[PDB]
């Protein structure tokens, strides 16, 4: 049969340009980092979302660092059961989990720290690095500062709280601030901290929804993910 | 004599090992590139592959440590077989800093090397790696100075080979070869404790809200194999070459230079045995066996 | 209106699933068997095909 | 059927004890974490505490850390949350909520959206 | 009122319930037992396709039960070649995150859909020989799970948004919606005559749906958890579900309840894909647990295993024919077994 063999040539023909292409596409999505930005609706995301790209189901945000390409995802237009769709997004670089950490009263904290904790401990993205965007951080200072809206009637271990010694906070923060700071950080860490895997890692940020280092933090988190992976993988971590 | 045969038979069994334990390495790292896309996985294959080469040149020198007769006409073969030895070794030794140089790169450039690094660097890698090998085992074939005059009609490596061709090996090989290594691991090692410190410093706050001599271990372990992999046999050859009335010889071509090819046996160990998913496709390979 | 709507076309639906045709479990159990059994030598991969029929070799 | 029925609740006094009940069928009931959340009138779903499979490991939300005691016994599919010194903010319906799958201690039952594992809900009420 | 309506729903269930009792004569099992079981089969890997770059998550064999489609999220849909393994196309996808695939019966369309909440057509055989989006259907409020070809112009689409739609390709408008669905609708099922189709809905519940008269004819709530995998029988009178509780479970649409359950103690994880062979006696089953379990439809035993995937199983399906079964899996990785 002639014409089967030249068919079969045809297709042979055509799967090596489409290894071809597949080669380029590797190339090209080995470069790029996938990162997936999630977090209450109320919160800022959607402002850093907007400081970066300075009805789809999903949107894509494209931003390079030092040349290199990152591919944030907003998720939205999506119901909020997201124990399924999170699922996709077990081999993103790191999951840009942003939280208004002034946001306790519906304590909305509450909820992301739940939230969190459904991240870090689903068997998916056990893999998946999370950069903890602990936003609206001048709102919290504000409302600690000069506010009654004291955090341990929400928190009752903050009474017992004390602020670590190696905490570093901004020059001219007044101790509360630093301290409600550091007490949601650690309360976040409440759950990055107990699995003690060391398969993904936890990267806590004090953010503000319009702070241009927040790509710089998402950078250096990236480059401390694939480090911390690569350490693992040579049993140096 | 018996020494003679007493060292045959160990590096007989030195050998078998060497070969065993890498063909299995071997295929196990061929069957992970089929299975993933890994590409420090190609370095792995090429360091078994250089192991396994390694033992098969030793496994030719078993032929002239038993009982054997020898003629002043063996020069060329021996020579050759022990510049096969030599390009084995150096094969063997740079592939190790080949993958030590992708680590380094992976750690400090984690961007720049998922960018760069593909299949076509891997097998270019490792192209020039069998050449530069090869060319500097076959060095003193051509080049005279190397070559040792007055043969007795005996086969070993000094025999052939002076001692000389061991100080350049040392001076422009494996000295710059082990400061290469040990600079890459030294920052390396500097960044893993950074990345331990800051993971010690979340878990402690976490805990409290509510070990770092691992990568030291590892480092002193790869380092420790690589420097007593040739380091003993190399310092031992420029103490030959300073000598006058010297004869450490015997010593040196027969209980040092057994560390550079038992490191064979120590280098898949380290490499590919050590890697979680080496390990994994091992397990799969005996259930394989077993379930046959 | 969503919160009592819901609970109205809910009963509707659940008025139009019980008045179906229901059928005994022994009977669709034993239509299942004669299907199973019909088809039997047509399942390549119940039955093991001969290599020489397989396109996969 | 998935089936979650609260039972228990209606007026009481602030600063009294309330024992809410949960009767759980058609399904495994050790085999799923288990929680309470409740709707205030006018406010979003809150998640309120939240009890292992095996009970060994057990949660509160910190307005109700040392208030309430979740617990739960599998030999007859029924959790229970031992309310104890009501407050006029605890007022609200609290659903009986089980988390999506088994064995996990994953759970993403707080979402807004009708969830299907959890019950009616029983209605609480904390009035002078 | 509302509690009237509790009441009123509450007694409805226990009618059906009741009604359910009454048919639930016999079980399948019992009646079953005489059969020779299927015994032992070992399938082994007769295709591994290469070349998808990210974890594959959905796939669907052809009618011609050679050529056939698989989804991964990195972009691409790549159509494999089965007797060859040559990819015949590879079309990159304008969202990354697609969730499901499908090729027509006539093998001319080919959809796909995910995150974007857009089910995607593309056209494989048009005039200058190039694969592009034929229509795009947005109308759906959630992410696409699941999407299956009635013909070259009608599509069952399932979505995030807990309903399913039936689409006209060619003008591009949900011509039916399907409501009723508490959670997420996952997996779709078209039956053989392409009358009737089924879904699960992370409500431990499936629906059966009048795909003419749009509206639902019948639900069965066995399962316990999220259901990922619905597959006809082939007969079209019965189907399988899968779910996150880590059983299988075969409903018949003439008895409206569940013949028999697939699991056994040391399976714990969630099922991901489900299928039926030509006739019905194998129920193949992709696992959370990196294994594809081979359950005889009959017996209520493991006629088999399917070990060869390193990761987690996201898709399985039979050819029409009958003569393989592929699996997918999140290894980037698809498996033909025969
Ligand atoms: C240059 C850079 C790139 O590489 C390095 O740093 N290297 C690679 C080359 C290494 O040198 C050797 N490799 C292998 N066999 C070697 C030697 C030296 N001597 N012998 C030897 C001794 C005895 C016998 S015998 C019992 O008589 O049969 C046979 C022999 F081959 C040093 C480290």
New binding site residues.
Partial sequence: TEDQRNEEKAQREANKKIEKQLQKDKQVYRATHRLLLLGAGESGKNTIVKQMRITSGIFETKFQVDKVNFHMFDVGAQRDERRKWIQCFNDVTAIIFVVASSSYNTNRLQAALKLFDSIWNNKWLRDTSVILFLNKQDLLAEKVLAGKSKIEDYFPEFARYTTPEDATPEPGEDPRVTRAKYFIRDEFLRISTASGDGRHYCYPHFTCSVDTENIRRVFNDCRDIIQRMHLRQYELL | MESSFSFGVI?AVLASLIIATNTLVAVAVLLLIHKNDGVSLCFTLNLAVADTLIGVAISG?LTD?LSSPSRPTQKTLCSLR?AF??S???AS??TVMLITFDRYLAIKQPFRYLKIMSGFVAGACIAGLWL??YL?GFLPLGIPMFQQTAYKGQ???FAVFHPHF?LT?SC???FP?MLLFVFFYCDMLKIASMHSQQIRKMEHAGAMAGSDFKALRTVSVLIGSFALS?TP??ITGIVQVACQECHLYLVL??YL?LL?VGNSLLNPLIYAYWQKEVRLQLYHMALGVKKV | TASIAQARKLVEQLKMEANIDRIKVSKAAADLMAYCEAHAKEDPLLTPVPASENPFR | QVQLQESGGGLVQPGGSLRLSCAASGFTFSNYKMNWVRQAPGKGLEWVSDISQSGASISYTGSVKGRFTISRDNAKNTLYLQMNSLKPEDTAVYYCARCPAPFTRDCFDVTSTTYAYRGQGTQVTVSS | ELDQLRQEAEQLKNQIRDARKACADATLSQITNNIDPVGRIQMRTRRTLRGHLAKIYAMHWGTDSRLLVSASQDGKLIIWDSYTTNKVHAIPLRSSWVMTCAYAPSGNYVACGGLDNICSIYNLKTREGNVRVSRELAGHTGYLSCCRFLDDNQIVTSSGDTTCALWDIETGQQTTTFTGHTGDVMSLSLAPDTRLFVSGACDASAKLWDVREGMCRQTFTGHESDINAICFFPNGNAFATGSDDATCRLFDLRADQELMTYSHDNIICGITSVSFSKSGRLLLAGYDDFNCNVWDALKADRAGVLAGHDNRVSCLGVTDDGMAVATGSWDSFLKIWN
Avoid: D, K, P, Y
Wanted: charged share 5%; with cysteine.
């Fill in positions: 590096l020198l440590q022990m030895v030599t084995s070794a150096a030794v740079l530069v090998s500097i086969c070993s490596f061991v090996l422009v090989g494996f070869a040739w046999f190399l071509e027969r230079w550079g």
